[PDB]
């Protein structure tokens, strides 16, 4: 006998209650604070991804995300998870086998690999994939019951997140002034909203062998909101030079821009500290809280 992290008996039973017969190799990730993620082989010879909600509050998010993915399936020139199982105890989809555009071993803080900066195919295809996403009609989002934020609601959300952080944490004075200046800087904010992925960075982008964008995963934050939400992580990973490339191609591909968009993206990236801190707070995890407080108190 060998102790293994996965409880195969329980996993089999859970999957079989929803029409999936597990058989063969699997792999498990318990790092997630909200889901257990298992990649398992099924009797169709295929790997499937099991997204297992940990708690009732997480389960409640399954049905609205299912509606999002159902709408998005035909409206994107790349793959998204096909939630053939979607219920409160289990989400399951056939694995999109293409690699993520960042590879990182579970538990590690350092990736093994990130698609290279000088990958022209990745840069170009990510820019056109993003333009396609942001071109999904708002009417389709509304019909799918998505969370919708007008430009005013988008700005208010940011203000509310900042204010929650200010109530709960002690924040570096220059940071606070930075966020407030941004919130007051009318020229920075867009006068429209788009369908956004909401958690978009190289870790949630899939690429084929040639490094062409072939899919996106983890759509749990998707909504109609500020387009720049989906560009801040590109700036973080690929820098200003990469952002500049992104924005030229994005616009050429029909993505709607505005004059201070690059500025706004950098301000959105700074605002990541708020997002992180609220994630830390809402999780109650002490290591995440320690990191968040340290960051918030630190000069940028």
Ligand X SMILES: Nc1nc2c(ncn2[C@@H]2O[C@H](COP(=O)(O)OP(=O)(O)O)[C@@H](O)[C@H]2O)c(=O)[nH]1
Ligand Y SMILES: CO[C@H]1C[C@H](O[C@H]2[C@H](C)[C@@H](O[C@@H]3O[C@H](C)C[C@H](N(C)C)[C@H]3O)[C@@H](C)C[C@]3(CO3)C(=O)[C@H](C)[C@@H](O)[C@@H](C)[C@@H](C)OC(=O)[C@@H]2C)O[C@@H](C)[C@@H]1O
Applying CB under 6 A, which residues contact ligand NH4? Answer: 61, 65, 147, 151-152, 155, 189, 198, 220-223
How far apart, in Å, are the Cα atoms of 10 and each of 13, 14, 17, 44, 235? 5, 6, 11, 20, 42
**Measured from the CB atom, is 27 or 152 closer to ligand NH4?**
152
Q: Does 52 help bind ligand X (rule: CB under 6 A)?
A: no
The C-alpha R_g of the chain, in whole angstroms, comes to: 20
Beta strands in 14-98 (DSSP E): 22-29, 35-42, 47-53, 85-87, 90-94
CB 103 within 8 A of CB 112: yes
Q: Does 147 help bind ligand Y (rule: CB under 6 A)?
A: no
Q: Does 141 help bind ligand Y (rule: CB under 6 A)?
A: no
**Measured from the CB atom, is 88 or 298 closer to ligand X?**
88
Restricting to residues 215-234, which ones interact with ligand X according to CB under 6 A? 217-218, 220
Of 42, 144, 196, 232, the residue at the interface with ligand Y (CB under 6 A) is 232
**Measured from the CB atom, is 219 or 250 closer to ligand X?**
219
**Measured from the CB atom, is 40 or 202 closer to ligand Y?**
202
Say which entry of ligand X, ligand Y, ligand NH4, none residue 155 contacts (CB below 5 to 8 A, set by partner kind). ligand NH4
* Piece of the chain touching ligand X by CB under 6 A; list 16-24, 65-73, 93-101, 142-150: 93-101
**Measured from the CB atom, is 222 or 247 closer to ligand X?**
222
CB 204 within 8 A of CB 218: yes
Q: Does 171 help bind ligand Y (rule: CB under 6 A)?
A: no
Q: Does 86 help bind ligand X (rule: CB under 6 A)?
A: no
For the chain, give percent helix, strand, coil, nearest 5.
Answer: 50, 15, 35
Say which entry of ligand Y, ligand X, ligand NH4, none residue 76 contacts (CB below 5 to 8 A, set by partner kind). none
Respond yes or no: is residue 173 known to be catalytic: no
Please choose, from the candidates 118, 117, 172, the residue with its C-alpha nearest in 3D space to the C-alpha of residue 299.
Answer: 172
Tokens standing for residue 18: 């929803």
How far apart, in Å, are the Cα atoms of 189 and each of 133, 165, 227, 236, 262? 20, 21, 10, 20, 11
CA 267 to chain centre: 18
| Spatial CB neighbours of 38, under 8 Å, sequence gap ≥ 6 | 6, 11, 26, 27, 28, 29, 49, 50, 52
DSSP secondary structure of 118-182? T-HHHHHHHHHHHHHHHTS-HHHHHHTT--B--HHHHHHHHHHHHHHHHHHS---HHHHHHHHHH
Say which entry of ligand Y, ligand X, ligand NH4, none residue 236 contacts (CB below 5 to 8 A, set by partner kind). ligand Y
Of 203, 256, 285, 289, the residue at the interface with ligand X (CB under 6 A) is 203
43 is in an annotated binding site: no
93 is in an annotated binding site: yes
What residues are annotated to the active site?
199
Annotated binding site: 51, 93, 96, 98, 218
Note the residues at the interface with ligand X (CB under 6 A): 32, 34-35, 37, 49, 51, 81, 95-96, 98-100, 203, 206, 217-218, 220
Annotated binding site for GDP: 51, 93, 96, 98
Annotated binding site for guanosine: 96, 98, 218
């Amino acid at each position: 006998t060998v102790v293994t992290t996965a409880d195969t008996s329980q996993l089999y039973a859970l999957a079989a209650r929803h029409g999936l017969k597990l058989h063969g190799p699997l792999t498990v990730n318990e790092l997630g604070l909200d889901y257990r993620i298992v990649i398992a082989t099924v009797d169709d010879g295929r790997r499937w991804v099991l997204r297992i909600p940990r708690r009732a509050e997480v389960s409640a998010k399954v049905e609205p995300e299912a509606r999002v993915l159902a709408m998005l399936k035909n409206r994107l020139p790349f793959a998204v998870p096909d939630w053939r199982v979607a219920n409160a105890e289990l989400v399951a989809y056939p694995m999109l086998e293409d690699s993520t555009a960042m590879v990182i071993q579970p538990g590690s803080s350092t990736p093994d690999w990130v698609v290279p900066q000088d990958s022209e195919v990745f840069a170009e295809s990510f820019a056109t994939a993003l333009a396609a996403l942001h071109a999904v009609p708002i009417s389709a989002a509304v019909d799918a019951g998505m969370l919708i934020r007008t430009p005013t609601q988008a700005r208010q959300k940011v203000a509310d997140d900042v204010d929650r952080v200010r109530r709960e944490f002690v924040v570096n004075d220059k940071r606070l002034h930075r966020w407030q200046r941004w919130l007051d800087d009318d020229s920075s904010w867009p006068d429209f909203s788009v369908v956004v992925h909401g958690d978009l960075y190289v870790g949630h982008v899939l690429i084929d062998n040639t490094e062409r964008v072939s899919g996106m995963i983890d759509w749990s934050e998707a909504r109609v909101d500020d387009p720049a939400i989906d560009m801040a992580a590109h700036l973080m990973v690929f820098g200003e030079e990469g952002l500049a490339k992104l924005l030229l191609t994005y616009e050429a591909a029909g993505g709607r821009v505005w004059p201070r968009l690059a500025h706004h993206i950098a301000e959105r990236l700074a605002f990541g500290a708020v997002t992180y801190a609220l994630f830390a707070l809402d999780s109650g995890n002490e290591e995440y809280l320690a990191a968040a407080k340290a960051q918030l108190a630190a000069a940028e």
